[PDB]
Design a protein around this ligand. Sequence first.
Ligand SMILES: [C]C1=C([C])[C]=C2C(=[C]1)N([C][C]([O])[C]([O])[C]([O])[C]OP([O])(=O)OP([O])(=O)O[C][C]1O[C](N3[C]=NC4=C3N=[C]N=C4[N])[C]([O])[C]1[O])C1=NC(=O)[N]C(=O)C1=N2C(=O)[C][C]C1=[C][C]=C(Br)[C]=[C]1
Lengths: 666, 133
Amino acid sequence: PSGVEGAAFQSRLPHDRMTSQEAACFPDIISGPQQTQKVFLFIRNRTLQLWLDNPKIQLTFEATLQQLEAPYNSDTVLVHRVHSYLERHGLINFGIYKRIKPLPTKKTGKVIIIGSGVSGLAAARQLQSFGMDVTLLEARDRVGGRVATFRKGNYVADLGAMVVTGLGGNPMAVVSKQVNMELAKIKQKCPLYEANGQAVPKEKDEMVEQEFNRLLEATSYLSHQLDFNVLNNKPVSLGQALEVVIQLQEKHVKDEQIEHWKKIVKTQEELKELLNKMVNLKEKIKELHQQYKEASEVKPPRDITAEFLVKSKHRDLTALCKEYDELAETQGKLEEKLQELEANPPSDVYLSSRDRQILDWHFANLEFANATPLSTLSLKHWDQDDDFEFTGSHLTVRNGYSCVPVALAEGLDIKLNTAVRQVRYTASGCEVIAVNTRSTSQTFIYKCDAVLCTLPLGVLKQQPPAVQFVPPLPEWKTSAVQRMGFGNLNKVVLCFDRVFWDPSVNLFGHVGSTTASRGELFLFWNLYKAPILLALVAGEAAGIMENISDDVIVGRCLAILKGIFGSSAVPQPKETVVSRWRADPWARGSYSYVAAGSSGNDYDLMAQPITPGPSIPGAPQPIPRLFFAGEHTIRNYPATVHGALLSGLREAGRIADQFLGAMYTL
Amino acid sequence: RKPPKGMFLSQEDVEAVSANATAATTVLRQLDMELVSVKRQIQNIKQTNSALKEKLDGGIEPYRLPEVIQKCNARWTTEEQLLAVQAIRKYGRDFQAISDVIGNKSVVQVKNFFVNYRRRFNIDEVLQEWEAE
Ligand SMILES: [C]C1=C([C])[C]=C2C(=[C]1)N([C][C]([O])[C]([O])[C]([O])[C]OP([O])(=O)OP([O])(=O)O[C][C]1O[C](N3[C]=NC4=C3N=[C]N=C4[N])[C]([O])[C]1[O])C1=NC(=O)[N]C(=O)C1=N2C(=O)[C][C]C1=[C][C]=C(Br)[C]=[C]1
């Protein structure tokens, strides 16, 4: 869309309805007259537009009211109530803008923020923007968390996120304007190269893919229409359900041969019965000719019975010959209605051995998308977010994604090499105890009003705990931490002196030999200005590869590439890097996924803040003290940079409301 | 509403392939067998049918009797009548045969005969005697 309505869409909101979140704050308006609702919505949309068209500078209440028109800019308590709501929840003036009114001389309240990944930084910026004392504790010696970018000379390659998923409504759309990131598109054309190292023909390539997509929807039908969602008490996984479909397609293939050749025999065996009738006719016919011949020997003149006899047998014979002729008739008909059936056998196979291998590369693509063995994804939910998809085509960051955190990080109080070890939160505040990563015994205490926890789910999952909560996290929170899925995926960065792949090809795949190794180096990316190739390790493989020395891996890599490009177009790599995220202690994996037995609803559980007990018993119920943001917290945009950023904005809104109060609800 | 065009998945079928850990390969093997057990009993009835085809070799050509192209008459030669009577005795009512035998009388002059001469050929007796067979 576009105009004022572009804004509502670009900001992920229905241009002609107030959201639940808005209802909450403007219950006067939404419960009131239709006329007013329209005014409101417009104001919202308009402001949005204004922010959007120019997101390199703060947008004040005044600057707004200014461009607003009558009748709309008549009621200024609305325009104020609205500009504020928007600002509070990072819909406007988020990211990196230029301040008009520099930052409130003295600050209010104090917040500790665990981790300076995007969710971290994003929330920090907001909070600081709202005038709070904010400090970030980061275990690593760089910002960005799971947004790694490798730099050396002019080699530049992400080991973290890498793709932006289309700007149509994507908050990153704004950041992209705010920060100098070079955004290049992904040309969706991806050639495949079997185990041998030779292209897969446009023939197969298309049939398999398309069978793949067919097989997917297939599961989707089992799920919704047949309700195949529990089995032997366990929740059913996507993998299971894909097997059960492939099986059934194999079954049906056979079922068809069976009743095709079974139609042959029922014909072939009419042909038996007919021949028997035919032989046993050439039978009497034989011996009847005899009798006629014999009774035509009696020479004339003859008496009448002997004459009749000749005349008789003569009939009986042309009679039996009519009969047997109408049968040779019939015979010839069946004899063809049999090459008919022999000409069209149904398919020999559901999938060939070369087929079912290629289908596997398509399953590895999915394994990659979700960072996990499809045997783990909840069938019922694995794709619940596929509704909230952005529009426009996917991109990559040509100049390394890290450029974004570093930009956000700017102007913020950040303690690198500071590993939070224990979180303690009480009726009247929290204290956070971290150590220094270099000499571990060297200890730190941070006192604050609220802690916002951006720890990866992997980290939150660690047994035994890497961070300790005091008092421990409620059983409803821990359960959600177990139920949820934290997957894995790894990168291999190949750095050369010369381009030797097709320069107009962003991505090309490799087709491993087995189901088992479907994920192993299954896809490559030419993304960058330098001669760099990126190799994915996904699915079951990813976990196992972390256990293998760099060299070996880079071995298998060149190996494959020679196979595809000729055994001497491929030099030695000048520089090579390899991720091990399940290994990395500040990640313990790649990003979350809806595991079997979880749901979208567990993500909500993750975001629900924690309210301590009371100190003095029979004292009033406290404020909530411990808050969560991060990729795993956001029902609708999980495992993504934009999703994190978003959750960060969310918790800031929520924290600020809490400690600075929401004036705009009156 | 319905599975993808060409994808097959009946309700009842699914429950069958999930029933245990290898109801999977069980069912797909029963058919693998069940098939050859047909594919094979083709040969059998193809070879049965093959020998029977060779017995019928030679058609009936040596046994064919030339064309009796001849015209209907009104006159019932005493010869013709006698052929008639014995035709009845051995044929009952198949007026077509009876016609074909006498050679030159339409399927109805025959019927008429039955009534005229019924009189003096005791066609009653003759006929009931054919019923004894
Ligand atoms: C790994 C990965 C890779 C390799 C790739 C990718 C990815 C991943 N993805 C995802 C993203 O990246 C994520 O989500 C984000 O980044 C996240 O963020 P946050 O939430 O914020 O978190 P982080 O970052 O991690 O941060 C955190 C922090 O904290 C800290 N710590 C820990 N511990 C501790 C600490 N501190 C203190 N103390 C203690 N103890 C750490 O260190 C940190 O800093 C992605 N995404 C996107 O968007 N894109 C892309 O591309 C991606 N990638 C790929 O490639 C694929 C994926 C995807 C998916 C889905 C979709 Br729809 C798209 C894409």
